[PDB]
Symmetry: C3
Subunit: 385 residues, 3 copies
Amino acid sequence: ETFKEYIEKLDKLEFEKMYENDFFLTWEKTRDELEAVFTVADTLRYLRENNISTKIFDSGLGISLFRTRTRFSFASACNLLGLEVQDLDEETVRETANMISFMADIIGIRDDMYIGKGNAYMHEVSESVQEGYKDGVLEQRPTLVNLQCDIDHPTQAMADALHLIHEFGGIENLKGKKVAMTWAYSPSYGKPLSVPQGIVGLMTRLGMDVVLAHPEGYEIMPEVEEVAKKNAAEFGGNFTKTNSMAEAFKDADVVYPKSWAPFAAMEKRTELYGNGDQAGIDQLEQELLSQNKKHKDWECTEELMKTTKDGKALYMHCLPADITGVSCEEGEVEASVFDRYRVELYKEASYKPYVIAAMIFLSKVKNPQKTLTDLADKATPREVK
Amino acid sequence: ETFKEYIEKLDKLEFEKMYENDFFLTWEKTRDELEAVFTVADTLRYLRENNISTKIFDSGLGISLFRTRTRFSFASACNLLGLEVQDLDEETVRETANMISFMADIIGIRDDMYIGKGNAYMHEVSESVQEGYKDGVLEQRPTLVNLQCDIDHPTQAMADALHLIHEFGGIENLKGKKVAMTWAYSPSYGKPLSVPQGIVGLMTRLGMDVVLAHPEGYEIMPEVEEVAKKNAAEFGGNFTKTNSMAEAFKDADVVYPKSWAPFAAMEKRTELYGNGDQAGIDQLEQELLSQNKKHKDWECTEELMKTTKDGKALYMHCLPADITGVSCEEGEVEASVFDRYRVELYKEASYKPYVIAAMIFLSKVKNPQKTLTDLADKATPREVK
Amino acid sequence: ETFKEYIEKLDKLEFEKMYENDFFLTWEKTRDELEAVFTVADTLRYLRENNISTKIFDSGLGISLFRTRTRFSFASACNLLGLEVQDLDEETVRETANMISFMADIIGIRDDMYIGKGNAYMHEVSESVQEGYKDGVLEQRPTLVNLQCDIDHPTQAMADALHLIHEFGGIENLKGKKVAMTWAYSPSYGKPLSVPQGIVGLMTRLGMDVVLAHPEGYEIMPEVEEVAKKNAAEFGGNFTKTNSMAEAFKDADVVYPKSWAPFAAMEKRTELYGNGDQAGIDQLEQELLSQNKKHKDWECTEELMKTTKDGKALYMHCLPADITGVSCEEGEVEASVFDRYRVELYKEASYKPYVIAAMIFLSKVKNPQKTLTDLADKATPREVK
């Protein structure tokens, strides 16, 4: 698409509320706001593809706050816009939020290890930073970008959605398509549910036919099931739950098989972690290990792919995947399946840097159309031509 | 204040000796030189508040040299001026000083754990770097900024002084004001004396009525007492020593209650550390723990605040403070007292980034007035307007 | 030399193949290509010496990939050209190579601990990154700079060669000169052979009279001996092997005495490391310790220096050196010898940042003459004048 087309698309969307605001969960934003992230994403790509610098800050920091793929993804986005990243180690939160912010425009936060704690922690940082700006402590109001929490993974989900839009030739062609978000076997102890919950909560916004397929006992956060049901019932398409991998793969257009630990188990883990009972934690993680040992047959196999739409549904995975007979003895996907989609899987990952930059752009530029246009006319070369 | 006023103030100060020089101790600089740091501090703030970039380096490094609040403070200052920070791990010093400096304009150093070692280490680095410049090894002469040593904490003290100037409406209104630099209870083993010595050595320059209040046995470096006595006797005001917290708080205009380990004890600690005797160190730190256990009553309490000027002296603390019943069982300050000054305490901290930038600016720009004016006329936007 | 002279020198060299290519081993490049690195090195120095910024990237990353002197050397080079460095911790390599590269223009790699593994690892990264560019995963093709491997140390060797060119007044004056690359005693377990192999493989290109002097049993990689023999026999000068330190020092114009572990021993070490046999490794390193204990007499001494050309051959060492009676009980060089050449040794090290920048420049600028000239005419100040 040409540059004129991108600007014209933004003009028929409404997104004034994204300015000087945070980004936590995809479903806290409107459909227009989500579409403004996609379009600004592609616009920044267009400009960089044509050797046009999109630096919008002459100085200022972006605070990275972990508690290494998203590490480089955030660093990339900041540098593209002209921000310099600083990493932080790991009313105390209020104090930490003001002390790091004096010359910070952005704060990216990853906190995904504990159910309940991660999302609340980001709200506290935002609130603290809002008050500091009001009380004159801070010259600006830093906007927060959720780089992964216990509830959602918005940068991953939106990068995944944008991949689909480009693979199927527009956001409207996603309507009616069948996406299988399923569980798969991992040797690992227990992975967060942010990706499964994140793409189920997002794809349901895009009018798709979404199916959540996991073995019994691996239920996701029930409040995210409720968000998906609403989404589908309100803005078209469907949401379905099932305990059969085959039933989900059958006639699927898209396939997303990644493992996760049971929501309930993560609630226990956090309470035990809060109580301090390390002996209980060790037992819980051993109990999970042998529970998911009973579902090794959950693997994205060449036989399963065969029962997909034309035997070639787009395989998606956030990476890295557990590849059977390469990364581990038994895993999420067969080697030959992975290899055949390798190019698509990497191209999928390429959208993440642009998605974070778009979120930053939208939260810091009151008139994106004008500034994007200003940046295009000046045409500052990022490389020597 | 307007921009014209800042330049005119610099014009009636003399500071030619700050160019291509280091900053170690506040009392090694003249009163005019100190006032040039305040004014350049406020000028850079003025410019950034009005969206005007103050980048003065197109490329070059600022070497950070620790041996996380000042970490971000130094990184902020460097980035504001256009320098990129690089962290170093922790005639060998001479070699290290030349090898890191080839494309370094600034070196910030924090070395505050051992009495005698820290200040000597910075002199050696400076000297090495001076000689390298003379012998053609180095294209430039990197200027050093003391980010905290065993003797003084110049960036903290000057940020604290600048806070006062803005709270009381000018540097001349500080004359006659009563500042209580006192000890307080901390559960921690033993904190450096750089802050207490630093603000006693600085506030005595500003014609204030300074009182050093600590329990018997907690004497500061006696050479810093001598600097304060001289300061007061020479440039007006007073310096007093006392072993009563109440007597210091009575009618105080400003109150600075932070704990520190006895100077003498720090001399032992270093000798033991030099001798290698770890068994002695462990005993010394246990001996301190129960010594300051006998002075839990040294706390900035709501009853003490009540005996201050109008019951509302400006509470100052470098942060973080030991808050009783929040951060610890028994600490430096009562929660309600802390909370009521929280806004001021954070605003105090905001001056540190600008103080470091000013020191850098003054050490690298032969004509500050002209360049500050050049930067104002060009008016390069740091953010999109 | 003036700027006009540098450009004219580049014009009578051919180096079109360096564009969008990697730099692994000095002997994989032509003599003209090597001379293009020297000239671009000196040109960037000339420009910076005259306060002229040489930033060529407005945004983009340089990935540093270790597996602290070259750390700062790489960071310096990147920043000079406008790139921002990001450090990485330590088909998986293929995945890692694409995931870090989305907005990376350069990748510097240090991997020098294991014979066979290091050079192969860089070829795999390059190949992966090449394919990604072809398949549309990557917007650009990142060029690799070998920051040190098991075979060569190209940035060190070229910095060393450039030092010589400036010490003896041109690359043509090196012809006929006698360079003693010799072993020396180190207390350390076992150092890589990349420096000895690197300068023997390079100096033989420059028509010099190179002698490899090491005690029996310390043979270097035999394939690098073969490269040196060829070099000398093909492009003039000589290569000789000897087991006498004196014979190598006699009438030497240049002296390079640094220790290294026997090539053969490094082959064992890696196999043991590959087999996992840690008990064998511990024994092998103890066997080396007492082997080189039998050659403490291999020291660059004041008596040896006396038998050099005029008793003042240029002493060279990559640094840091083992100095006898300062850094250790017994080492590579006598203190008085080291001290007298300290200035030259540091100036030698100063070329490394410019050598890395030159390699980057040549791999990313299709017309160096034009852009270097463009940068000179614009004359963007790096410092305020």
